[PDB]
């Protein structure tokens with residue numbers, strides 16, 4: 001009447017970034033109690049066994065990983081108790097530990113019973129209810145064994161909390177709040193920021209509630225804290241300190257930035273770049289800094305990995321991919337256009353079906369905003385405008401309406417000046433894009449159209465015009481394509497999932513791998529990246545208006561337009577075509593992001609379409625799933641609550657709706673985020689290629705700035721873009737963000753092979769991983785195809801590998817993580 005069990009756990013200091021004692025776990029230090037799934041007490045709840053303590057250490061187990069320890073335990077379990085389906089655990093030690101798993105042995109297998117826990121367990125006294133863990137069986141609510149129903153419900157209640165209180169490190173409570181934690185008005189009134197969310201003026205997704213309470217000077221803004229809480233099991237430990245990349249962002253803002261600033265205040269290094277070679281020096285000979293600065297930076301975990309140093313004077317950045325073959329190819333019009341479909345931000349270009357382009361802005365405020373570009377000024381390789389429009393060969397990168405509402409405010413800032421830009425592109429007969437005109441607009445210096453030129457001062461004006469475009473694009477990329485569309489938009493679904501879908505639930509099991517480290521990095525970003533006087537406001541053009549601009553764009557965010565095929569159609573770069581494998585034909589045939597993306601999209605779709613019917617046979621089974629209905633209701637009406645009235649939200653009454661919702665969530669969290677994230681340093685590590693700010697408008701003829709432009713185009717370029725000190729800070733942060741941690745979990749992988757007992761789901765997940773390996777071979781073949789080199793490699797000779805599913809660790813320019821993990 002004894003059940004043998006094996007507990008696997010990791011002591012605290014293995015996952016920390018000062019001593020563990022393994023014998024302290026024995027004795028009466030850790031109790032487990034098995035809970036019956038089949039025999040109930042008088043109240044219908046599963047019977048609970050006796051407190052059972054860890055008996056001894058098990059070193060003979062071969063499947064142990066790094067930092068893991070295994071303990072033996074035996075449970076007395078007589079014939080009255082039934083079959084175990086859950087257990088309680090009570091930690092009587094003063095230190096927390098990380099519980100991995102419990103396995104219960106039987107005569108054969110089945111019935112081996114596996115419990116996958118992966119949870120931190122603090123001292124029993126710190127919890128209002130005893131921690132509970134379930135076996136790895138999957139149940140929709142109506143299929144839950146009756147003795148486990150109440151436990152399933154209770155646990156969901158423990159995860160929701162009551163909407164009050166300051167959250168502590170060990171809490172596991174998931175709830176929503178608005179973005180009212182970014183300002184710092186108690187420190188200085190200039191650090192006040194608008195609350196984002198909860199209004200029609202500033203709609204915004206919700207974020208994880210922390211509950212620190214109000215500032216003294218503003219009751220609506222949350223006071224600052226040393227640590228921004230996330231529910232405990234969202235705060236990931238790492239076996240290796242170099243893998244705690246998310247912490248490097250905090251160190252950069254707290255420690256490194258002040259040190260760099262001191263070097264410039266003391267005039268120990270020149271304050272400005274003077275030539276393009278001064279920039280190239282950063283990854284060749286390095287930058288020379290004072291010894292006390294070097295000695296302050298290189299002892300720091302994570303930060304020390306970002307640079308090569310001689311330990312006394314030099315920091316060297318890694319060579320960006322974009323310059324690895326050609327140092328000058330970034331300056332070509334061909335590469336400028338190519339990065340719109342294969343660069344860091346390849347998802348904004350639109351088709352143009354009429355000419356000239358028109359504005360949607362109020363003519364009363366911004367006056368006439370019809371484009372000043374004339375058809376007769378364009379070199380379309382012998383096409384007429386009529387023929388180019390009709391053959392769908394015209395495209396546009398249109399930042400006019402997005403930026404015009406903010407140009408006046410931005411241009412008032414001290415060292416910031418910009419235009420609202422439009423770029424017209426032409427798809428040549430050879431399949432590559434050609435920029436044919438840039439329009440630089442200001443509300444109410446004038447508003448002008450610049451055409452391409454290769455000689456004379458006009459060629460420098462054209463180079464500067466491209467810089468203003470890419471300043472627009474970089475700002476839109478970081479704040480919208482990256483921050484808003486992935487990080488910020490996903491966090492409400494994470495919260496809703498934990499509050500309303502049991503760990504037992506099939507859809508919990510499907511989605512939660514795609515959330516790993518997403519709340520954690522977001523909380524660290526609210527603290528150090530997107531906060532008042534943080535790294536983003538220091539480096540990027542809009543300064544204090546940066547995050548508020550993303551609120552204006554969120555007004556037009558549409559969940560169902562995040563599906564890749566819908567995105568391509570809505571931007572006019574594809575047409576619906578049932579004759580094609582993916583249902584859409586690309587108007588730019590070689591478009592690397594879209595062509596590769598459609599393959600990944602189809603593989604995820606097949607997986608979701610095979611998994612869902614394993615648990616839902618009919619539309620009725622979706623409608624009647626209480627947890628699923630509560631989840632989606634809360635995700636829409638609380639998590640994205642400022643948009644809850646919009647008609648495009650799926651209703652979740654059918655199998656098709658469930659598939660579509662799951663598919664979009666997985667797409668956003670994996671491939672979409674990867675495509676916009678892991679190219680940041682590869683393309684933007686050369687500041688001239690991806691400037692983050694502009695500091696002046698075009699010089700007027702007859703001025704000394706204009707003469708300088710004639711005699712020294714490199715200095716003219718450098719005076720306009722991001723200055724030297726913010727460049728050093730920006731390069732550091734995008735190096736972190738572009739790096740794969742060695743403990744990443746990639747699409748097609750999971751962190752435990754026993755995440756469910758359902759063999760049909762395991763097999764379908766095997767077919768998903770096999771399909772991803774076959775797609776990777778297809779993408780390799782595309783990068784070796786000479787007929788695609790123009791768009792897939794370009795003048796920079798950089799094969800588009802960002803949607804290769806697999807990667808090794810490091811700054812690799814490839815690999816699709818499961819989640820928004822950095």
Ligand SMILES: [Fe+3]
Pocket residue numbers: 482487673677737820821822
């Ligand atoms: Fe990211």
